[PDB]
Scaffold this active site. Structure first.
Site, PDB file in Angstrom:
ATOM      1  CB  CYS A   1      -1.145   0.148   1.319  1.00 54.47           C
ATOM      2  SG  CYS A   1      -0.205   0.494   2.572  1.00 54.47           S
TER       3      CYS A   1
ATOM      4  CG  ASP B   1     -47.869 -34.853  -7.950  1.00 54.36           C
ATOM      5  OD1 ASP B   1     -48.433 -34.478  -9.320  1.00 54.36           O
ATOM      6  OD2 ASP B   1     -46.783 -35.797  -7.904  1.00 54.36           O
TER       7      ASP B   1
END
Lengths: 586, 623
Positions: A31, A577
């Site tokens: 950095c 179903d």
């Protein structure tokens, strides 16, 4: 290389459950001197421009209406930020912004749905897709506002006079939280939201439970509640790490589940072979409950169950973990299966990353059961135990697993993991293997369910029977043993659930249950002599125009189907179903 | 189904029994086939055959419906279209099938002892039921005796059908029963030839397919019943009901045979590596022995020379036979010399003649201790390592133990140097109990010091046998038999406390029983024989009474399960001794006025087998 050894398979491919990491996804920087920052910027640009969506993701062609809605929702977020307004875009409000869009080609919802996907994957909208109870009908605009509200609720360190062992009254929570909404016009949305994130779960009709406010271990005799009985089952979980908030959410889920069980014993359900799950196998009347930040005891008619964090160090592998002990004088250990399903559900929902192994295949979590024979021999120390995976792998085949430290002293599985041997239901409902002329032939196949299980034609006690058998194996390896144990455990959970829902029902127009077996894991239903409604219906439909079955017969069949559906609805059971193939004729 | 593979059998009526299903039950359906391919004669013949078939239908329906017994194939129902009716279908097919299957791999008793006896009983019971009904079989054979269970605890195993897979009477059926018994015991058909006329002439002339001897068949009572059944004079043949009565005798159940060796001088019983049932004869140069193997009924060793002095006992210790001679010496031979063990491998001296032995295993040492009960009530301890005897003894003095711990008066009759007679191990061999006079003394097998004194009997009584047994609850319990009192007494081994008494001098032990707290000589007891969980008590009269314990509120009630005596053992004299030679074999030895010894061997049944026997008779009586 190290970070790849932590993420790559020994073969050099990506290890199971891990991302696809290579040399091309590695970099280092400083950095101060800015070493390598240009390299990382170039790498980011390379991978982004190389991102394939379909065309490339970067610069992909997207309708101008979707972009216009993007600017519209951004403007709405900015407006509410200026207005100090609450950041919920209701379904109605998103639909309104769509309506307000100029040159809008969005006419049916699916176009909007694709647009929503865009708005989520560009960081414009935030979504928590909980379809239960219509909670899905909300979208979020600002991550910062979201985090601020969640920190504000987390920030409330109410005293014991405020947090009654972790629960605060609904009005008190509503008042305390005003400042970022929480008015009468937003209370319902806010509590829906908190329930979705499991931050403030409803408690009776009085309060809401905040899992981070659980009380410390109260000064109560949690050891005097234990019985010196042989009907004792113990499990021990070891964990490479303990997720932050693991215990709070876990304990809160058992608390609310016990509460709703107590209510029902005085609303999402399932029927047929379906993915939806429920603790229908749990039918226990509680007597007392104790709970604290890192555990809970529940005492019920006939026994109790305790869960508590423990320093598990099997084979000197000290790490996070917990112990569970369940005692029941009636051999009903459904509470342990209840806790098992809760463990699985919690991890899958909130810490699914933990459902994996190390880069070398070592499980992130492991489960063991203390050995009754070794514990008896000792009765501390590193007393022996059985791997849960081996336990389940052996229960499906054999009544027995050998003890390591005492090879010639048998440990029964049913005295080890009775949830995999059905010590709950009455013995009269057991299916005798000696009396079943089961056949797995392709011509014996009567049908197939949604569970991946096969219903065969067989004979039981001379009766023609429809035996649903479960086929678990899918062809020394660690991963194989792990996958096998997991599938067997899931199949046994389905076994218990189906047995519970079948035994709980008795109506004229429902297929009855004959019995249930462990070896093989299968159970018998009544077999229809006339096959399905679809079969005979087609046969009679070929030679008629309308009412193939006959007037009276057609009316009676319609009545019977309606009666069955009404019975299931009275039981709060949902079919989902219904079709001619599973309506069977007698 | 009329398929050729569905054919279960055929009857003498020309009708066919097929395999079928009725109400989901497997059934044997006898169907009648009448047609034999406009013509007048055809119609007439057809009607006549149909009429005759219907007459047979009615007759068979009447005789089937009129009968209900455990061992007869029952009738399910009767039909008109087709003219047929259903019987129960045998899951195990015919007796002939399984009998041949088990006969291929055995010599005698292919089905097993108890199962063979039960099948014979069931066949006799069925024949007796038919004779009571005045019904005559006339075609009894293995093919039409059908099997339903091959178990021994099961109640019913077979039933008799009317189909297979000039003057007649009950004696003819009993002759056929004798043939069925031949097939049952041997497993082979009575193969007297291929032409039935010549087989019949041979049978009528007394020619029979003679099997081995009682030593080989080992079920002599069935052999006697058999031979009596096919007697060429029908008037002498037994009645079926009489056979049904006879089979309930436990003597039939347990007696196997007897074997006689002629003149001897003494008898001893060993563990069975060799000298399993040894008789001793001769003296000095002519000293010799004869060994019987009870599992074969053979004398592999007959009067094999063994020079030396007269012996009272011979303890077999893992290889080494310890002959207790009257010269105050134990002559230790070894099996390396096979039978003619003339040269001893060791000679161990004692201050008194050895009267009895015991070999207590020290498992913590993987060694043995041979404790020799001497002629003066003292115990000689000889360690044994891998069959190698040691001379460094330890002599245990009863008088010193009394002076130390028991403090019996020096003027008491208990001070007599009474020879040690009985010796036993208790507490997994942790202690050794031996009888001294009316009392008993317990030696600690670790220190070899005489640790306890028990008083099962009081002076001037004398204990002659001591045997340890354990009830099914894990209670280890020790009997002590007395000669003068003619009674046994039962102690708890872990407390050394008397807890029961059993009087043996009972002229009529009609269900003789006694409590347990938590011709005169003929009734005299012989020995304690602990077999499984029961105790056999032989008596001088030739009868052995077997006792067990019934649980009652924690206490026990000792009771006879059966009284056993083979009357045919009478010519061999008084019963002198007995032994348990195997877990499932028992022996008892008689001597007569000529000093001629005989061995009679019984099935070493426990509570399980006697209970199965008696329960089978009671239960079948209830069905």
């Amino acid at each position: 290389a190290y970070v790849l050894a932590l993420c790559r398979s020994p073969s050099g491919s990506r290890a199971t459950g891990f991302p696809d990491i290579t040399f091309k996804h590695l970099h280092e920087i400083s950095c101060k001197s800015l070493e390598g920052q240009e390299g990382l910027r170039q790498l980011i640009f390379h991978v982004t421009c190389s991102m394939k969506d379909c065309q490339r993701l970067a610069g992909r062609l997207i309708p101008r209406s979707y972009l216009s809605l993007q600017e519209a929702v951004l403007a709405e977020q900015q407006r509410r930020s200026r207005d100090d307004d609450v950041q919920y875009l209701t379904d109605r409000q998103l639909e309104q912004l769509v309506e307000q869009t100029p040159d809008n080609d969005i006419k049916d919802y699916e176009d909007l749905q694709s647009a929503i996907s865009f708005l989520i994957e560009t960081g414009t909208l935030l979504h928590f897709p909980d379809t239960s109870h219509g909670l899905r009908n909300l979208y979020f605009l600002d991550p910062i506002w979201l985090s601020e509200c969640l920190q504000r609720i987390f920030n409330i360190k109410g005293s014991r006079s405020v947090a009654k062992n972790g629960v605060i009254r609904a009005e008190d929570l509503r008042m305390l939280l005003v400042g970022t909404g929480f008015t009468q016009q937003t209370e319902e949305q806010y509590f829906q939201f908190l329930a979705k994130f499991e931050i403030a779960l409803p408690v009776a009709n009085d309060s809401y439970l905040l899992p981070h406010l659980l009380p410390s271990k109260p000064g109560l005799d949690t050891h005097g509640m234990r019985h010196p009985t042989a009907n004792t089952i113990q499990r021990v979980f070891k964990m490479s790490f303990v997720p932050v908030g693991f215990w709070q959410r876990f304990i809160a889920r058992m608390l609310i589940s016990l509460a709703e069980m107590d209510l029902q014993l005085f609303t999402i359900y399932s029927f047929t072979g379906n993915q939806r799950n429920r603790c229908s196998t749990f039918r226990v009347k509680r007597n007392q409950t104790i709970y604290w930040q890192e555990g809970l005891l529940v005492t019920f008619d006939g026994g109790y169950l305790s869960v508590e964090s423990s320093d598990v160090n099997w084979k000197k592998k000290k790490s996070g973990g917990m112990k569970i002990v369940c005692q029941s004088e009636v051999r009903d250990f459904s509470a342990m299966a209840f806790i098992t399903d809760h463990v699985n559900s919690l991890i899958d929902q909130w810490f699914p990353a933990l459902t994996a192994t190390e880069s070398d295949g070592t499980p992130l979590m492991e489960q063991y059961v203390p050995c009754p024979v070794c514990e008896t021999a000792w009765a501390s120390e590193d007393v022996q135990y059985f791997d849960m995976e081996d336990c389940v792998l052996t229960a499906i085949e054999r009544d027995f697993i050998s003890c390591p430290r005492h090879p010639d002293l048998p440990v029964p599985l049913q005295e080890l993991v009775p949830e995999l041997f059905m010590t709950d239901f009455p013995a009269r409902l057991f299916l005798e293997n000696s009396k079943l002329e089961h056949s797995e032939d392709e011509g014996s196949v009567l049908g197939q369910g949604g569970s991946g299980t096969v219903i065969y034609r067989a004979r039981y006690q001379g009766q023609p029977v429809a035996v649903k058998r479960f086929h678990i194996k899918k062809f020394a390896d660690t991963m194989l043993r792990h996958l096998r144990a997991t599938d067997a455990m899931k199949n046994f959970s389905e076994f218990r659930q189906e047995a519970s829902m079948l035994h709980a029902l008795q109506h004229p127009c429902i297929v009855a249950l004959i019995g249930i077996s462990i070896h093989p894991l299968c159970f018998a239903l009544e077999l229809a002599p006339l096959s399905s409604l679809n079969t005979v219906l087609s046969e009679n439909a070929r030679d008629s125009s309308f009412i193939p079955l006959g007037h009276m017969l057609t009316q009676k069949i319609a009545y019977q189907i309606a009666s069955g559906l009404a019975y299931l609805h009275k039981k709060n059971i949902i079919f989902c179903d219904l079709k001619s193939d599973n309506i069977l004729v007698w | 189904s009329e398929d050729e593979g569905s054919v279960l059998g055929q009857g003498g009526s020309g009708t066919v029994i097929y395999r079928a299903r009725y109400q989901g039950q497997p059934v044997a359906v006898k169907r009648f086939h009448i047609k034999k391919f406009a013509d007048t004669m055809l119609r007439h013949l057809r009607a006549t055959d149909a009429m005759k078939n219907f007459s047979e239908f009615r007759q068979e329906a009447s005789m089937l419906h009129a009968l209900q017994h455990p061992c007869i194939v029952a009738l399910i129902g009767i039909s008109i279209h087709p003219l047929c009716f259903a019987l129960e279908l045998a899951p195990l097919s015919s007796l002939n099938t399984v009998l041949s299957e088990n006969a291929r791999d055995s010599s005698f008793i292919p089905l097993g002892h108890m199962l063979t006896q039960k099948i014979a009983y069931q066949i006799a019971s069925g024949l007796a039921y038919l004779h009571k009904k005045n019904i005559i079989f006339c075609d009894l054979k293995s093919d039409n005796i059908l099997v339903w269970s091959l178990d021994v605890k099961e109640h019913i195993n077979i039933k008799l059908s009317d189909y297979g897979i000039i003057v007649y009477d009950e004696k003819v059926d009993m002759f056929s029963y004798g043939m069925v018994l031949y097939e049952l015991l041997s497993g082979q058909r009575p193969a007297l030839g291929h032409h039935q006329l010549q087989i019949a002439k041979k049978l009528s002339k007394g020619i029979r397919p003679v099997l081995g001897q009682p030593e080989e068949v080992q079920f002599r009572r069935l052999q006697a019943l058999m031979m009596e059944c096919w007697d060429t004079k029908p008037e002498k043949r037994p009645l079926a009901l009489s056979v049904v009565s006879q089979m309930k005798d436990p003597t039939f159940a347990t007696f196997m045979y007897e074997l006689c060796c002629g003149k001897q001088t003494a008898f001893f019983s060993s563990q069975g590596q060799e000298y399993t049932v040894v008789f001793w004869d001769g003296k000095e140069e002519s000293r010799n022995y004869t060994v019987v193997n009870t599992e074969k009924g053979l004398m592999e060793v007959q009067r094999m020379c063994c020079p030396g002095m007269k012996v009272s006992c011979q303890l077999q210790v893992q290889r080494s036979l310890w002959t207790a001679t009257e010269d105050q010496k134990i002559y230790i031979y070894t099996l390396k010399g096979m039978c003619p063990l003339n040269t001893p491998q060791q000679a161990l001296d004692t201050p008194a003649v050895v009267t009895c032995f015991l070999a207590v295993p020290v498992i913590k040492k993987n060694s043995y201790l041979v404790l020799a009960g001497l002629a003066d009530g003292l115990v000689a301890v000889f360690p044994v390592v891998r069959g190698t005897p040691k001379d460094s003894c330890s002599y245990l003095c009863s008088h010193t133990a009394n002076r130390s711990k028991f403090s019996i008066a020096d003027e008491d009759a208990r001070q007599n140097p009474y020879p040690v007679k009985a010796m036993e191990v208790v507490n997994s061999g942790s202690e050794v109990w031996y009888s001294n006079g009316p009392g008993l003394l317990v030696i600690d097998c670790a220190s070899l010091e005489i640790c306890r004194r028990l008083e099962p009997y009081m002076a001037p009584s004398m204990v002659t046998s001591v045997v340890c047994s354990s009830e099914g609850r894990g209670e280890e319990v020790v009997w002590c038999l007395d000669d003068k009192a003619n009674s046994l007494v039962m102690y708890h081994s872990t407390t050394y406390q008397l807890c029961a008494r059993y009087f043996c001098g009972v002229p009529s032990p009609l269900r003789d029983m006694f409590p347990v707290r938590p011709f005169s000589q003929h009734l005299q007891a012989v020995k304690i024989l602990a077999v499984r969980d029961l105790i056999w008590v032989p008596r001088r009269g030739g009868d052995v009474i077997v006792i067990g314990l019934e649980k009652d509120s924690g206490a026990q009630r000792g009771r006879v399960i059966a009284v056993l005596k083979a009357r045919e053992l009478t010519p061999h004299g008084v019963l002198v001794d007995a032994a348990v030679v195997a877990k499932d074999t028992v022996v008892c030895t008689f001597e007569n006025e000529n000093t001629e010894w005989c061995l009679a061997v019984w099935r070493g049944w426990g509570a399980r087998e006697f209970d199965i026997f008696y329960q089978s008779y009671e239960e079948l009586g209830r069905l």
